[PDB]
């Protein structure tokens, strides 16, 4: 899978952005959200989020879903490194387990 954020930005640029956040905001995590490639679902206009680390994955889903051009009944699923996260996990927990070398957490969403 290929996040467009990674095509649009050099690693060293992304790492500087992610590392600054981690060192200056202990209560926040830098998150990229993009549609999974094969996904068949409405579009999200913004991809770069600064996310309270103590939000649960379920709470993050609620806030993100509001921003996706969706049909009212559409559900979506999050994948982090190809795994659907638990909803009771927090974004800080996911970040510790799954952040990439540029220090971002990447979430792909899909209609699945």
């Amino acid at each position: 899978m290929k996040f467009v954020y990674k095509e649009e930005h050099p690693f060293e640029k992304r790492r500087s952005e992610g590392e600054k956040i981690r060192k200056k905001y202990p209560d926040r995590v830098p998150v990229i959200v993009e549609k999974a490639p094969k996904a068949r679902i409405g579009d999200l206009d913004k991809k770069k989020y600064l996310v309270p680390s103590d939000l649960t994955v379920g709470q993050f889903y609620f806030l993100i879903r509001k921003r996706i051009h969706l049909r009212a009944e559409d559900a979506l699923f999050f994948f982090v490194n190809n795994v659907i996260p638990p909803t009771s996990a927090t974004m800080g927990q996911l970040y510790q387990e799954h952040h990439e070398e540029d220090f971002f957490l990447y979430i792909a969403y899909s209609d699945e």
Binding site: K13, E17, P30, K48, Y49, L50, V51, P52, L55, Q59
Partner: peptide
């Protein structure tokens, strides 16, 4: 360069 979306205005609806 790319701006951050912060969700600050959103947290109110979680309370």
């Amino acid at each position: 360069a790319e701006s951050w979306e912060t969700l600050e205005a959103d947290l109110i609806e979680l309370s």
